[PDB]
């Protein structure tokens, strides 16, 4: 985290903690789907997930994406996690949790 | 005799006994300086009972810490808790009550671990 905040400094974000909080905000799926019974052919129904679970979900997606990106490359965990937090602090669809947030919300919108 | 307060501070079977006497403004942990704590990451944690009140509270006191048991993180939390306890006990027993309340308020408002002993013990494994 200390290396990552240093990187987000040197990548011209003077407020790296605000970069962290904006990546928390901009990568939280507001609504998702649950698997209701539905009578055999189990459809998925859009529930509106709790904002505490949105925080949990965003942190989980960011750590999963950073652990996917930092595995099997020369680029360090701090650089990959800083790249993800900068591309996810403002929605750019070059990070992980932006894409998967979009996927969960489009499944939720398709399935309400 | 130099006016000294002898006060424990514990963390996870890590007991750091602190001897806060009237001295030069000198701080030692196990005969090693507070500048040099064995983990580099936890270093400012030991500075957390120091700068939460101020630095002119320290020139009057020579501070001793001697440690038994624990690990690496456990001894760091033990010594910072022992520093806070010895400081407020010095400012209780010798210095007036109000300055002790101010120091205990500054410690309590940020981290109550520095004044209150912890309880996260490994349970008996329930046979």
């Amino acid at each position: 985290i200390k290396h990552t905040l240093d990187i987000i400094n040197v990548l011209t974000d003077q407020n790296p903690i605000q970069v962290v909080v904006d990546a928390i905000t901009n990568t939280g799926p507001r609504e998702d789907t649950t698997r209701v019974g539905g009578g055999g052919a189990a459809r998925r129904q859009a529930v509106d997930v709790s904002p505490l679970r949105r925080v949990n979900q965003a942190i989980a997606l960011l750590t999963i994406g950073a652990r996917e990106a930092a595995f099997r490359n020369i680029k360090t965990i701090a650089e990959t996690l800083a790249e993800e937090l900068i591309n996810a602090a403002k929605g750019s669809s070059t990070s992980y949790a932006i894409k998967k947030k979009d996927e969960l919300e489009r499944v939720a919108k398709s399935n309400r | 005799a130099v006016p000294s307060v002898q006060t424990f501070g514990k963390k996870k079977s890590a007991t750091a006994v602190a001897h806060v006497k009237a001295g030069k403004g000198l701080i030692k942990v196990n005969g090693s300086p507070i500048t040099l704590v064995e983990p580099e990451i936890l270093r400012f944690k030991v500075y957390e009972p120091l700068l939460l009140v101020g630095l002119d509270k320290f020139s009057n006191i020579d501070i001793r810490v001697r440690v038994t048991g624990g690990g690496h993180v456990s001894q760091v939390y033990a010594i910072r808790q022992a520093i806070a306890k010895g400081l407020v006990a010095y400012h209780q027993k010798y210095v007036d009550e109000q300055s002790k309340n101010e120091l205990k308020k500054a410690f309590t408002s940020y981290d109550r671990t520095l004044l209150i002993a912890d309880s996260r013990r490994p349970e008996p494994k329930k046979f």
Partner: protein, 143 residues
């Protein structure tokens, strides 16, 4: 306000004191330094092949000044490595006693460490003076 070993960092003291022992060179350095790894719980010999023995002696002298006395088995315990046994997990393995014996003979021949009647290698007061002086010079490197 005594300038001593108790005030300086660990690795900085070992680097500085090993550098003084390299520039002096007045110790007992064996010929199997380029051959023999420091412990049986290792794969490769140390990378500072011409100068890991002085690093070893600096670690030993620092470890002796801080306490009452040491032995050979205690410094074998101190260096101890997690050794892989192939398909078996890691286990604690103590180091070689020959490196300890030759380091302590090199530092006792120069008059820094000495055998104490509790059967232990303690720091001599000349060694106390020398280590406190070079620790003072390490502090004066930081001005």
């Amino acid at each position: 306000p005594g300038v001593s070993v108790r005030d300086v960092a660990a690795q900085d003291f070992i680097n500085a004191y090993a550098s003084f022992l390299q520039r002096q060179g007045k110790l007992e350095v064996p010929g199997y330094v380029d051959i023999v790894k420091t412990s049986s719980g290792n794969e490769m010999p140390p990378q500072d092949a011409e100068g890991w023995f002085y690093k070893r002696a600096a670690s030993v002298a620092r470890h002796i000044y801080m306490r009452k006395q040491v032995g050979v088995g205690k410094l074998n315990k101190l260096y101890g490595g997690a050794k892989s046994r192939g398909v078996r997990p890691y286990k604690h393995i103590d180091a070689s006693g020959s490196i300890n014996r030759k380091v302590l003979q090199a530092l006792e021949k120069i008059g820094i460490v000495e055998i104490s009647p509790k059967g232990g290698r303690r720091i001599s007061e000349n060694g106390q003076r020398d280590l406190d002086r070079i620790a003072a010079q390490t502090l004066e490197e930081d001005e």
